[PDB]
Amino acid sequence: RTIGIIGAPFSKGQPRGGVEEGPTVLRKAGLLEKLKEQECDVKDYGDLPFADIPNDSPFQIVKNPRSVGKASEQLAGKVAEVKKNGRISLVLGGDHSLAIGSISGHARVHPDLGVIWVDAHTDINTPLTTTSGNLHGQPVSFLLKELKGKIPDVPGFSWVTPCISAKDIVYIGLRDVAPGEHYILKTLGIKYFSMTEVDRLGIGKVMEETLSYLLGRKKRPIHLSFDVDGLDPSFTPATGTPVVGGLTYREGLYITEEIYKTGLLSGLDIMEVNPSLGKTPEEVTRTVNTAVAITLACFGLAREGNHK
Numbered sequence: 001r002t003i004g005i006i007g008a009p010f011s012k013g014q015p016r017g018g019v020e021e022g023p024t025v026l027r028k029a030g031l032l033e034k035l036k037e038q039e040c041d042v043k044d045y046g047d048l049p050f051a052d053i054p055n056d057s058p059f060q061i062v063k064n065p066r067s068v069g070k071a072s073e074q075l076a077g078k079v080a081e082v083k084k085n086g087r088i089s090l091v092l093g094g095d096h097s098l099a100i101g102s103i104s105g106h107a108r109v110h111p112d113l114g115v116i117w118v119d120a121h122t123d124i125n126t127p128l129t130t131t132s133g134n135l136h137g138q139p140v141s142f143l144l145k146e147l148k149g150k151i152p153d154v155p156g157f158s159w160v161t162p163c164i165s166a167k168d169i170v171y172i173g174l175r176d177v178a179p180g181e182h183y184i185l186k187t188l189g190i191k192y193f194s195m196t197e198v199d200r201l202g203i204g205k206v207m208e209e210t211l212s213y214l215l216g217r218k219k220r221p222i223h224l225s226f227d228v229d230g231l232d233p234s235f236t237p238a239t240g241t242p243v244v245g246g247l248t249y250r251e252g253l254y255i256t257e258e259i260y261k262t263g264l265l266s267g268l269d270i271m272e273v274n275p276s277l278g279k280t281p282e283e284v285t286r287t288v289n290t291a292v293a294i295t296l297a298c299f300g301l302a303r304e305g306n307h308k
């Protein structure tokens with residue numbers, strides 16, 4: 001379970017911009033260092049410099065498409081790289097649009113990967129369903145095979161090619177899903193566990209089924225794209241789109257303690273942490289701390305204890 005820290009200080013996937021200064025708060029909070037206290041082999045590929053694109057006019061109402069499509073394309077090759085090194089890719093990111101390039105490059109080296117998406121939103125808006133233009137709520141849209149042919153030609157993404165099927169992804173923690181997104185959910189038959197199902201089943205059963213839905217016929221690679229807003233705002237408040245009634249600190253730790261234990265963690269994304277959105281000093285450290293703990297759990301830190 002070797003690690004390949006990959007920093008993606010990107011933000012042009014939504015309005016607020018301090019999200020790109022996240023690989024910093026995390027890195028400085030002690031991430032890579034605390035990972036060493038664990039039997040983790042860690043190699044930091046440094047922060048990915050995402051040069052700006054000055055000339056990036058809206059495509060229809062889709063914002064910074066070329067800036068977003070390039071930074072995702074940039075990450076795709078960088079993630080493919082650490083993956084072709086026998087390392088789990090750790091993507092400390094800015095916004096969640098980077099999951100287009102994150103999952104994409106992972107699939108290049110591992111086309112049989114299953115995606116586990118922890119979020120309050122499904123982020124499955126097509127350039128035609130979305131009503132905000134923020135590309136951070138459309139990433140799953142560019143990634144699914146079923147929908148290609150329904151995904152227009154947004155400038156900057158011609159390097160993309162649907163890598164996963166609707167049946168290779170699960171959603172945990174949904175509580176804010178748009179009408180266009182819900183129809184794509186039900187239509188393509190995407191398996192998901194919104195907050196209603198976590199409430200009915202308990203995260204224990206929720207996690208049992210998720211993994212069994214993904215590793216039932218073959219023990220295939222798992223891609224955990226974790227959005228900190230999946231967790232309730234009382235834990236990770238320094239985030240762009242917070243919704244009440246979210247996953248608890250403990251459920252945040254339970255989801256990842258279980259995933260780790262499969263030994264199949266292959267790729268991970270810690271997205272949407274924005275310090276500047278913390279209305280107070282301890283709001284930023286509580287978001288970053290909850291983000292560091294989710295990461296450590298993904299790599300072995302167990303609440304019951306650990307011993308050499």
Ligand SMILES: N[C@@H](CCCC[B-](O)(O)O)C(=O)O
Pocket residue numbers: 095096119120121122123125130131132133134136137138178227229240241272
């Ligand atoms: N569906 C809204 C919200 C997106 C939420 C994105 B996320 O998961 O990265 O916080 C939009 O399309 O702009």
Ligand SMILES: [Mn+2]
Pocket residue numbers: 096119121123136227
């Ligand atoms: Mn998201």
Ligand SMILES: [Mn+2]
Pocket residue numbers: 119120121227229230241
């Ligand atoms: Mn979200």
